[PDB]
Design a protein around this nucleic acid. Structure first.
Ligand SMILES: [Mg+2]
Ligand SMILES: [Mg+2]
Ligand SMILES: [Mg+2]
Ligand SMILES: [Mg+2]
Ligand SMILES: [Mg+2]
Ligand SMILES: [Mg+2]
Ligand SMILES: [Mg+2]
Ligand SMILES: [Mg+2]
Ligand SMILES: [Mg+2]
Ligand SMILES: [Mg+2]
Ligand SMILES: [Mg+2]
Ligand SMILES: [Mg+2]
Ligand SMILES: [Mg+2]
Ligand SMILES: [Mg+2]
Ligand SMILES: [Mg+2]
Ligand SMILES: [Mg+2]
Ligand SMILES: [Mg+2]
Ligand SMILES: [Mg+2]
Ligand SMILES: [Mg+2]
Ligand SMILES: [Mg+2]
Ligand SMILES: [Mg+2]
Ligand SMILES: [Mg+2]
Ligand SMILES: [Mg+2]
Ligand SMILES: [Mg+2]
Ligand SMILES: [Zn+2]
Lengths: 49, 71, 111
RNA sequence: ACCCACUCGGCACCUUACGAGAAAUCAAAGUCUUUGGGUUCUGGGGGGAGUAUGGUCGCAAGGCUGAAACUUAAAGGAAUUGACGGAAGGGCACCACCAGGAGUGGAGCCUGCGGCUUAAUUUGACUCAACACGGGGAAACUCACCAGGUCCAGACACAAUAAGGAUUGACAGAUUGAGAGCUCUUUCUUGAUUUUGUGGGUGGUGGUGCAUGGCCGUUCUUAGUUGGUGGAGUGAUUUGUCUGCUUAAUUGCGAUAACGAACGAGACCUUAACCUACUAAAUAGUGGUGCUAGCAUUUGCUGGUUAUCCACUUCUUAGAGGGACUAUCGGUUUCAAGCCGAUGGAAGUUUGAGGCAAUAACAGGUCUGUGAUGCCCUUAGACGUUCUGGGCCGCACGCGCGCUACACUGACGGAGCCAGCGAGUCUAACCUUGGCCGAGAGGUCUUGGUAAUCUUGUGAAACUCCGUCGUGCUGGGGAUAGAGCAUUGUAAUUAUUGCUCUUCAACGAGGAAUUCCUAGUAAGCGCAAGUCAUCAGCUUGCGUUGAUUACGUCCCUGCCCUUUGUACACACC
């Protein structure tokens, strides 16, 4: 247990010393409802009698 | 605890009937279509919706209840 | 279970702590509850230097059979304190004297 | 007869350990893997069992001899550390006593607990360490209980239904506590969001605190815990860590096969005491001065005046420092740690009071704080959830915490009139001055304050002063009850609270018992905060007035330590 526990602190030093040195999609949303706001998009008529 | 009692008669819910309903319209011979069941004057109801025929009653269901119109 | 906590203490200590204490409380694999202190080095438990020098965390780890408490204690080295007191109120240091070469009958200097 | 020296041969003790042993120990239990002086006897895991059987002896009881089948992984020895004792020796303490104080126990009501009652009267907890505890003062809510009524807020997958409609809603009526389309009547509306079925989730103040985390209580008003180098032992271990002495303290002195340290106590931190020294202040305050009122007048005395100016920091505030270290001296003592007395000092009981607090233990409490949680239970005629009403308050009565009294060191009526800890309203209705009106409770028009700025100098209460009553259940006492007026709130009936009138109970100092307490303490006295729409007889803090009696001990009770016994170690449950 203790020997494998020690080697764990050895792997936690590896990662620690290593990382200390180591090694667009536009058109939005509210703009796309305004760009598609060019309409021809509806229909209305009703209401007689 | 205790677990149950029940002097019987458990409650039911509702069926939304069946009703092949909209035959209620009429077409003379080729093709004039005369509506039946007068429609509703609420600007919320676009004259497609109709009224229900009871005693004293013509009733808009498109208004979930609203506005008793009586003829 | 010991591999974990004994490693944690060995990383905490090799990180330059003054001392460390780790407690796992709960149920692992048995029906009954147990607890284990895991300690190395130096911790102080009393008074104000507590708030200064030891950093305590408890955590609930939720496992298939039940829930364990994790309890960690780190004593940071008061020598490195930066902003704060630099030792425990116990610490009394005596500055060491000088070996003297006396005698040399009086005379005087002049400038 | 004695004394002294020697010598045989005895009964033993003492110290040694070369030596032996698993140790305890042992001049043999030594001269033993470096194994051989002579000889007799007995044992070969435990139980079966000293049983059966045969023989033999005996009057007999029984004695000597003495198996096996079967069963079984231990039984056993010495030593160690724990734990426990209805063994002994030391201690500590107003949750112990001493000397006393104020009481509780008696009465009335307040309140929790039991019990009974109940549709339900939700529930946890039962010696200190359950019972004004769950911050638990519940009218709705809370709420878990009871009588009933809706709702899905049933994620997701597949499947079934089905655009000729999978599904939703509803006016009026009937119905319902109900202006719930709950359901029903009738016939509109809705558009793939649901429905139905399985599988899987989900919620639950449902169960399990004896499955857990966490937190808390208790042991503990305690003084204990460990490791380095050395010493003892094959070893677990021990010594250090101890007779005594001292301390609140494993706090120290001292003794010392130990030396020298660490955790815990201490240190530390917070608060109350002291700073005419430091830095300042119209959100604190003083003096001078104007402007100014009253009384006197010889100048005087007593006030008004958020800036009309000047100066100050004693008072108030809080920054930085200072200060005490039981100092000085003297008694007392291993002249050691310390103790005691006196002087000085703001302060000398750990300065006073708190915060923090090692290792360990308990099937202590808490799933009813938690969207912390395992498992179990339930999941649509719900133990989910909401809505209406009731219930936790129900009263032959047992227990406990309390409040008010039994009066004259007093009630009452005038009158003097003095604190400290607090807290207060934004996307809102909190703390309230002042002016009116009202007997009061209150109402009402305005007002300052997000605050050392306004409430508020919180003009509190006990208390002081002058009267009235005069020992008579009296004008002490205020339960019970009637009648009316107000406030909070959607709601006040089982009476939320407040006022007025009337009604005028018990209780004439409390049995056995038993709690709490050593100085600004006890006790008497109110206040603010918590809770809070309204409700304190509770609690957490606060100041006011302010004693008597110890300054000791182990008798009682309680626990801590040694020694000792142990066949316990899941540790006397
Ligand atoms: Mg301390
Ligand atoms: Mg007594
Ligand atoms: Mg008495
Ligand atoms: Mg239970
Ligand atoms: Mg209800
Ligand atoms: Mg419906
Ligand atoms: Mg299921
Ligand atoms: Mg299931
Ligand atoms: Mg428990
Ligand atoms: Mg005491
Ligand atoms: Mg010493
Ligand atoms: Mg310490
Ligand atoms: Mg000053
Ligand atoms: Mg003096
Ligand atoms: Mg239990
Ligand atoms: Mg549960
Ligand atoms: Mg109750
Ligand atoms: Mg009076
Ligand atoms: Mg009378
Ligand atoms: Mg009276
Ligand atoms: Mg309020
Ligand atoms: Mg209050
Ligand atoms: Mg309470
Ligand atoms: Mg023993
Ligand atoms: Zn309509």
């Amino acid at each position: 247990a203790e020997k494998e526990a020690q080697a764990d602190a050895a792997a936690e030093i590896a990662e620690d010393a290593a990382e200390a040195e180591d090694a667009x999609x536009x058109x939005x949303x509210x703009x796309x409802x305004x760009x598609x706001x060019x309409x021809x998009x509806x229909x209305x008529x009703x209401x007689x009698x | 605890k205790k677990v149950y009692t029940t002097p019987k008669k458990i409650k039911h819910k509702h069926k939304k009937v069946k009703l092949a309903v909209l035959s209620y319209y009429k077409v003379d011979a080729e093709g004039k279509v005369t509506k039946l069941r007068r429609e509703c004057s609420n600007p919320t109801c676009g004259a497609g919706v109709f009224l229900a025929n009871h005693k004293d009653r013509l009733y808009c269901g498109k208004c979930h209840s609203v506005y008793k119109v009586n003829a | 279970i010991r591999r974990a906590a004994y490693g944690v203490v060995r990383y905490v200590m090799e990180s330059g702590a003054k001392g460390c204490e780790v407690v796992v409380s709960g149920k692992l694999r048995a029906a009954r509850a147990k607890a284990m202190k895991f300690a190395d080095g130096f911790l102080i438990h009393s008074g104000q230097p507590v708030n200064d020098f030891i950093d305590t965390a408890t955590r609930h780890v939720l496992m298939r059979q039940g829930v364990l408490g994790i309890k960690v204690k780190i004593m940071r080295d008061p020598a490195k304190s930066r902003t704060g007191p630099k030792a425990l109120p116990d610490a009394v240091t005596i500055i060491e004297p000088k070996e003297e070469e006396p005698i040399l009958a009086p005379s005087v200097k002049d400038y």
